[PDB]
Amino acid sequence: SIMTVRTTHTEVEVHAGGTVELPCSYQLANDTQPPVISWLKGASPDRSTKVFKGNYNWQGEGLGFVESDSYKESFGDFLGRASVANLAAPTLRLTHVHPQDGGRYWCQVAQWSIRTEFGLDAKSVVLKVTGHTPSNNVHVSTAEVVQVDEGNDITMTCPCTDCANANVTWYTGPTFFENYETGTYQPLANKNQFGITWFSSEIAGRASFSGARNLVIRAAKITDAGRVWCELATGQGELDADRSSTILKV
Missing domain, CATH: 2.60.40.10 (Immunoglobulins)
Structure with missing residues (x-):
């Protein structure tokens, strides 16, 4: 479901x-x-x-x-x-x-x-x-569902509009062990306008950014399956950020 x-x-x-x-x-x-x-x-x-x-x-x-x-x-x-x-x-x-x-x-x-x-x-x-x-x-609109065979790599895109020089943050989830209404989003990867990147312990060592936004995950694991989100933020205001999700199959 x-x-x-x-x-x-x-x-x-x-x-x-x-x-x-x-x-x-x-x-x-x-x-x-x-x-x-x-x-x-x-x-x-x-x-x-x-x-x-x-x-x-x-x-x-x-x-x-x-x-x-x-x-x-x-x-x-x-x-x-x-x-x-x-x-x-x-x-x-x-x-x-x-x-x-x-x-x-x-x-x-x-x-x-x-x-x-x-x-x-x-x-x-x-x-x-x-x-x-x-x-x-800013407006983000990602693919609804994508799939990658175990052991292979995949490049997840983050199509957008009015997203020039936006900070990029990918998340997984949300999960509901602490919050039932919205859940909690877990940071996956990040790339700021200074070219500095961060990756969660779950993918560090087999992931990188391709271009300004796309997240490349290498050697897919079955535990990689789930929902991922791409968020672009150009400021602290609510209109300055947007995110969309994609279901990653296997």
């Missing part, structure tokens, strides 16, 4: 006072338990504030989910203004938009009682409030 989240728009603009919709869709196979939909605002899923959370309620074998039997809640500054009309295609609607609503929003969908990095995915969408939010913010 692998979770994959997709977004049709990288950025959506809206005049202050108006209403906006941030598209989101997901795919989850081999699992009939209702996943938890989470919309989070921030630089990354693990460093954000809650906007909305929801999930269908298991009906029964063969019984599909019913929008009416579900948990849906908006939080904090978004309470009463944020909603998701269809949890199966969790696009977010935010009404009465304020300048402060501008920023980076994450659509995260995770299996119920998530216990594997394979059951969670997330992608971000920039909410631009006409006349207040800067445009042309």
Whole structure:
């Protein structure tokens, strides 16, 4: 059962006072338990504030989910203004938009009682409030799934836009032994704008960067399988960072 989240728009603009919709869709196979939909605002899923959370309620074998039997809640500054009309295609609607609503929003969908990095995915969408939010913010969009035969090497790419001179950090996971909501992302590799690189003990000695972003892993191990993330950051602000995941098969 692998979770994959997709977004049709990288950025959506809206005049202050108006209403906006941030598209989101997901795919989850081999699992009939209702996943938890989470919309989070921030630089990354693990460093954000809650906007909305929801999930269908298991009906029964063969019984599909019913929008009416579900948990849906908006939080904090978004309470009463944020909603998701269809949890199966969790696009977010935010009404009465304020300048402060501008920023980076994450659509995260995770299996119920998530216990594997394979059951969670997330992608971000920039909410631009006409006349207040800067445009042309970093955007990352990686392959959903790639595979490499044991013993072989693979080059994982990190396609992007408005990513010139960005710091690059790859992660694995997230894992859920300390945090169940978003999990914790484990650093895998890093390359700063000074040409200095770092690699986790799991791959140090058989990995390197190819170009400015791509991570090359040599002599693939079965324990290498899992989800990896490529994050590009051009600053400390939430609009200054983005990340996307890829499932690495064997």
